[PDB]
Amino acid sequence: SKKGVGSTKNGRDSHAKRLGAKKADGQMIRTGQIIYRQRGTRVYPGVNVGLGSDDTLFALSDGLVKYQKFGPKQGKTRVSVVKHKLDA
């Protein structure tokens, strides 16, 4: 005897968006490359770093990326692109 079985009601899931950090600290980067994909600003933008229509951080100039902790109780993260600054 099988006795019959009930029915499940929740078996739905969405595609996983590949968010998170893309360029790590110290890595050289050119303008227009993605540095951080997020839903809501988890990492604030600094100098030479822009914002998009999806809160995506992208570079605005050549240089080395650099994360700096700031804000109350050092709970806010900020990214920047420190220009090559070769300056001979």
Partner RNA sequence: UGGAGGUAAAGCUACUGAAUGUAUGAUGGCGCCACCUAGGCGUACUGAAUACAAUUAAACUCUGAAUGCCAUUUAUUUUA
Partner RNA sequence: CGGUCGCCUCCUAAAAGGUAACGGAGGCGUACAAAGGUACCUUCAGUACGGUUGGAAAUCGUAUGUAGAGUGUAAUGGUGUAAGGGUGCUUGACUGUGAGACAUACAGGUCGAACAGGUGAGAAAUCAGGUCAUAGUGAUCCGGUGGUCCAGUAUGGAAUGG
Partner RNA sequence: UUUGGUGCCCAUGUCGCUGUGGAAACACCUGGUUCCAUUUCGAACCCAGCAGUUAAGCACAGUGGAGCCGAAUGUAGCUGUUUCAGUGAGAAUAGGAAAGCACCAAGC
Q: Which residues of this chain interact with Mg ion, rule CB under 5 A?
A: 16
The binding track of 9-38 with respect to other proteins, each residue x by CB under 8 A or -, is x-----------------------------
Q: Given the rule CB under 7 A, which residues bind RNA?
A: 4-28, 30-34, 37-43, 50, 52-56, 58, 60, 67, 69-77
Q: Rank residues 15 and 85 by Cβ distance to RNA and give the closer one.
A: 15
Q: What is the dihedral of CA 14, 16, 17, 18, to 10 degrees?
A: 180
- Which residues in this chain contact other proteins in the complex, by CB under 8 A? 1-3, 5-9
